[PDB]
């Protein structure tokens, strides 16, 4: 074993083998043990990974997620597998089945949301299906007939209920909704979250990942679970969250993803003759959230800032989320060049100690940087994929290719890790993470 | 869709996806519906297909098969999945659980055997494991410690009980044991099988494959099931089969496979310091069955003949089994050149109407040729793989490469069919056949 | 015998082998015999094909072409190789060395121009160089230092002498300047070219390509050569050509390429700190010619029209030049969607009889279509490459990938043909055409 | 900057680009500057590298080499290019044109020989040709018609003049004839070469490779050039060399290659109906030299020894030549297993400090090992290729695949180095070495 890496064909085979191994039947777990249920934006990436293998099964993945959509349009971030234990907080802790008027009737789910990457998976499914012939196109088109209305209600819930003041940015009531639990982005907002009488609990996550340097701290978990108590006390009522929640942030990365997803979904709606009023609403939201992202940006570097709604203060941190405007567009030409210089330079992809030319979750030169600790440093394959795909859509073919090339180099150990140590390449988090396999499958072609 | 073929990475991913989809837990079905249990030589090819994906799981496949080995050493050709229906004849029809003193205690199996390709899978597992590092080598070596004795008992049962007169050829008591149910090889022997009072039955196979041109006939099935009645009447007693069975043939292709497998297993035994008496016995059987194969051969073309033990007559047919001596070696140089000329010329791989340069199961110029009918014509990916691997082991690197190249071209539609129409390339038999996916995975590397 | 196609590695090897074989030392011929000299836009694509093999030799190709630049900035379309004949019209016929005040010294050239794809080649060279480390970057940067001013003069001459009315479109004085000698685009303009006493001549092109269905007619060559007589009579003076040329057309495809090239060169100028005044002029021209292209388009379909300056008439034809606006952008959203539908539908890439999903030079349903006859119908790999690269730069990643995939499929016979029959795939024109090899090399990566 | 390695397609392209760049027209130089002439066994490997690009040009390479064959059948090791200097000793130093009765007319050559790998190149050319269809087959068959007799005379001269005692081993009169100028194999024989008055000279090789650690010493060159004086003094007469040469050794590696080459050429002769008497002689020589190689081997390890004819002493050294019997076969089973264990163990491919699992020219644990110094330790791609091809011909498919994989990994920097430092992988010797490019081209397929 002078070189432990796999060839492209061995790697693609092992990624497909993994994805089928994590398939419970109609949903794919995000990982074998650490995340043994369906997560919302993981499910979108899993559908992308399944599209080269089975358009029918990729569609089933999104059908299963959309069957758990709330009555008001929200897609919740966890759809729990029936009778499966081992993730905390579990269905009993959320108590949405009893408390939440809008929760679905034949599914157990969480009570918060996650980024709307789902339209992007729909586009990848359609692109695959169109290369495969008439009966496969029929399958993808029947999915659109079945779920276009549900996708619209999802986008409409985000635009009307999480952007109540039409600022063009998505408000979050939990850091988990950003997809980045312990990102330095949320530290000053979480410092203003003071738990009251928090019901006793024991973590499950650090029983599986026992190295304490790779997961959040107990104090952070106390704050994560307290926010659940605040939502539960108002029975997850959208109208009441602004009045009671101790955590209210506008997430600029989520907002930029939503801008892209609206434009993607509008293009799908035009291609497939969906209602014109829907397409118009989608294009309107795409531009509003593009403008809302650009309004946050640093006047010199173009870097995007999150916003603390309770403190009424811009949140200035050095994480990958600063590059949100690169995803959706809209910066003045001059400022977008400066932002690309930031991305490629020694604070991020050009840092000289990096093993791969990839985007660390937090800049290695930030004092918040921790090379092992979840979203505080490590390189995440899922972010590499999203940036590469969005860059290709901006027309930046060579930038997209370079990220794909380094992403595949990093993944060629076959660990399919959740995230990787930025300097040594050590695989961290869960092994056999479904969306890492999915990124590899989509890249390999 | 100007071209429906998959790239090598898409094809490898789809083959791995298939193999995991056919995994019931500790055994892989030979196909989803037509063959919903474990078959013996399929299980060996499945282990070859799993070795690039998981050495641990490839080992489990062979452990599961060897746990169904009979007390006298026989590996039976079907290990039935618990509580699974849809294949006939099923466990009730065989009745080995009640009738057969040697049947295993916690497994339902058939009562006949199949070709000993298992040593070849063990070699592929070891070759993969040695590229993967210390803990993976440990897994493969623990399997050898656990099952070397069982593999020896398998080879010893074949050599002592199916070659009672030490002729160096394996006697079969059912055409199913050849792996080629309806091969023209067995027609004259089956014409001497006269069913008595055969208990009523309904076929299951042609409920799944309904095109009558792709499966054997009802009259052929009557003979297949009558031979079961003859074995059952003597309770599957090895000592009594020569006295009662209406079908007794020496199978030269099975014999040549056994010769190769003995030499492969002896080399493994030397590499891993197995008992010297075992290695010596294996080399002895390798040479005896090589000599027994060569003794059947046509003096002009080198083609190998099967032998009808009851009629005491050589069986002269034009099938791929004629090329048995190419697998094990031993022909005089002159005659092996003539046999290769036969293989490559217009009766087989060089026939001008073939879509791919592959070996049809029956020569297209034989009057027995039927282009759709199971073993009477179609091109079988499993045979392509076996010939290519044996050719590479003879040192015929370019011949092996050409078969691999045409095999991958044929499989690039992604149907993973059981067999293919030789002229049009139409996929036939079951789709999603496990050993076809396994061949592709092993070839792609 | 069963599959004449090459593997990607064999095809890449043969493409590089061809490019080196057509290298005369400091210039590469466009083909071995039909085009045994340097052609201007072929040299740009050749530099693109050389960049993965040797950045130094790619730079030499462009240095050689630019050493032949006219004193007013024009890049002539042929740079003749020393002492080579076999192409007509050759240097004696053009007589630029004796007649043209602006012709270079110590190079022999034609007296007309060709499309400005050169900036695209510079970008590909720079992209390759930045992946190769310090010494290779220095070679490419030194080329910029040495040739930026010549590239500016080339673009300035197009913008100021071939768009003297600031309409944002390039005027041509010969069909050869379009790169598409016999395109139906020019038929109505050539119909008004009436030759006088034309000095006699013998074609060389149809001594080499003898099939008369594949090349222009004698009548067409008479008009081609007559236009030369008109230019020669005014000593190729820019100020006098408007007064005397019988052929004056605005070429919308050339104009779109110029817009793209100006934008590409402007971004290079910013990245490498070229003078601000130059970058501002390049962005000004990029916008002007983008607008000039859009001004030609059909309001329903988006199809771009050429313009006959002498007849003052829009030239409405059904060729791939209609798709000019897709290259440079600028169409309203609805009109660009309509133009893409035209491109993908049954009149072009969707035509049911096409062997590959590629853009034919003329629509197969046009009365002007001739499937073998040069630019009147065949599929040209150079156009496939240019459309796929421009599409990727628009962000249309899947559209670009499909063109690349089909172009590679078409090229996989290894003929490296100049163009291909659109229905049968028969290779046509010259074999061993340098820019077809270059496209393959750039695509295969 | 993060990964200097090339993709397989880029590497294949660059290898072909190099081979065409070293083509002088009808001969290919072994390197651009260090070896600016045709070398005999390099030309064979070059023909192998050309065969995937152009069977016609591969045949031309061998035609050129054979047009330089001596009248007695010897193929000389250098064919000098017209009017090229820069290699010493050059044609003036050899003086074969004036002194050697058997030297060719209108070619300038050296006066010594080199290993007979040529038949292997003929087989690869034929294998490629048979995949390309009728006209390409005709080119390769016409080469056989034209050159079979010259190939027979080459083999007959080796068998009759360099094995005059029918011992089945080839006698050399210069270390250069082994292809391994400064191998430790020859140190004790060179220790008895005492030069007299040697006409003065200046090396050219170490003007080009200036690092003295990478080339032989001045003292060694004095002995090399003195042996020339001894040959010249008897006008290169075969009958007189035994009486006068101070260096006479039987080369067991050369002998094994000759055995393989005789067997390969015999099979070609049968396939293409060459005269029966020739094929019988080739099989006779194949067996004789197989036996002569085995006669040298250590009875415990199988390691093959060279033999010093003057000292009448077996030459016991630890170089890759010890593995000669693995190429040609003939060892008893137990002895060959022992020799493979030596090859794979810590003295060769298993040494823990090696960067790649490749065969070093001298064992790193030998007192004679020097990691930079030519044949005293470095890893040579040409040996990797020759071992992997011969291993595949033995049927050792996995052993051949591993050597090919590691050789491709080592070559993936694109230096195409003559040899590589075994521990660091630093490229050494000449860059752009033609037979390293040829090995890559043949491997990549
Ligand atoms: O949401 C949580 O409770 C834990 O979140 C982690 O696991 C999820 C599944 O992989 C992802 O969706 C998140 O992005 C990741 O940070
Ligand atoms: O044995 C049977 O009852 C039916 O046999 C067919 O199905 C089996 C599973 O694929 C194979 O093992 C045989 O080779 C094939 O002919
Ligand atoms: O027909 C001609 O005499 C020359 O024109 C052809 O050859 C040139 C070299 O390939 C190209 O530059 C043109 O695009 C192509 O049309
Ligand atoms: O050192 C020298 O003067 C010549 O010898 C070297 O160059 C030749 C061309 O590569 C090879 O034929 C030999 O194998 C190699 O040893």
Author numbering:
A (entry chain A), B (entry chain A), C (entry chain B), D (entry chain B): 2 to 446
Study authors write:
A glucosylglycerate hydrolase (GgH) identified in M. hassiacum and found to be highly conserved among rapidly growing mycobacteria is likely to be responsible for the rapid mobilization of GG accumulated during nitrogen starvation by hydrolysing it to glucose and glycerate. The MhGgH monomer displays an (α/α)6-barrel domain typical of glycoside hydrolase family 63 (GH63), to which MhGgH belongs. While the active site of GH63 members acting on larger substrates is located in an open, solvent-accessible cleft, those of MhGgH and of MgH from T. thermophilus are covered by a cap domain (subdivided into A′- and B′-regions) with constrained access through a narrow negatively charged tunnel. The crystallographic structure of MhGgH revealed a homotetrameric architecture, which is compatible with the oligomeric organization of the enzyme in solution as assessed by SAXS.
